[PDB]
């Protein structure tokens, strides 16, 4: 599973914490404004966002998934890029 536990969408700019938990750059960033120095999954202390999960980024390039709204087949590494330019998604919000 390449889902982010915070936004519950496919990961975008995946970042791994001290505690081995993987989130969108922007989701772990935002969590640390609200609840600072705290992992938004396991509540453990965090000195920082973590590091790029380049191992996770890599395997998402070789994974595919049909879009929840329009059902077109999308590379996992490109899913965020699709959903922000998917008319159905946009016609919901």
């Amino acid at each position: 599973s390449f889902d982010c536990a915070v936004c519950l969408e496919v990961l975008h700019q995946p970042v791994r914490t001290r505690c081995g938990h993987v989130f969108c750059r922007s989701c772990i960033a935002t969590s640390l404004k609200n609840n600072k120095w705290t992992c938004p999954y396991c509540r453990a202390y965090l000195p920082s966002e973590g590091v790029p999960a380049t191992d996770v980024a890599k395997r998402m390039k070789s994974e595919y998934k049909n879009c929840a709204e329009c059902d077109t087949l999308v590379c996992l590494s490109e899913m965020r890029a699709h959903i922000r330019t998917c008319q159905k998604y946009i016609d919901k919000y």
Binding site: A5, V6, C7, L8, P40, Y41, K92, Y93
Partner: protein, 149 residues
């Protein structure tokens, strides 16, 4: 569309796709930030066979703050008062952004199964849960029959 709205919408999709067994929750009209939830009284608890109604108010910075959740159905419990306010750590200082409304409903279900006499909201019911369980079980099943049935 805010991240709060997208996340509340995602959670609603997931609950329709893989329904829970002893919980229904859904928006009230077109207000996506205002949900009503039903939970069954847990089997092998004094609440069994009762249906309990809950009001869920989502904050505009969801999921970084917890939903506000109160019982509308009256219930005899040390951690739920007459106003239907719930003392539950994950609805307060132990909220985390990874928690979802279904994890909240299950956590509330378990609070019916295993009350928290230490750190109570209704000291009179806490006192009785601690000293004479059979009494708490008698009165709780009495309130379930009048209110939740």
């Amino acid at each position: 569309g805010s991240m709060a709205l997208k996340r509340i919408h995602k959670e609603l999709n997931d609950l329709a796709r893989d329904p829970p067994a002893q919980s229904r929750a859904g928006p009230v009209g077109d207000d996506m930030f205002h949900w009503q939830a039903t939970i069954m009284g847990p089997n092998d608890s004094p609440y069994q066979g009762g249906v309990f109604f809950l009001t869920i108010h989502f904050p505009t910075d969801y999921p970084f703050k917890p939903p506000k959740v109160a019982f509308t159905t009256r219930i005899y419990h040390p951690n739920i008062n007459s106003n239907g306010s719930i003392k539950l750590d994950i609805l307060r200082s132990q909220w985390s952004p990874a928690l979802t409304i279904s994890k909240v409903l299950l956590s509330i279900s378990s609070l019916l199964s295993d009350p928290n006499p230490d750190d109570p909201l209704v000291p009179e019911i806490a006192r009785i849960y601690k000293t004479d369980r059979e009494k708490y079980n008698r009165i709780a099943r009495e309130w379930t029959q009048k209110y939740a049935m």
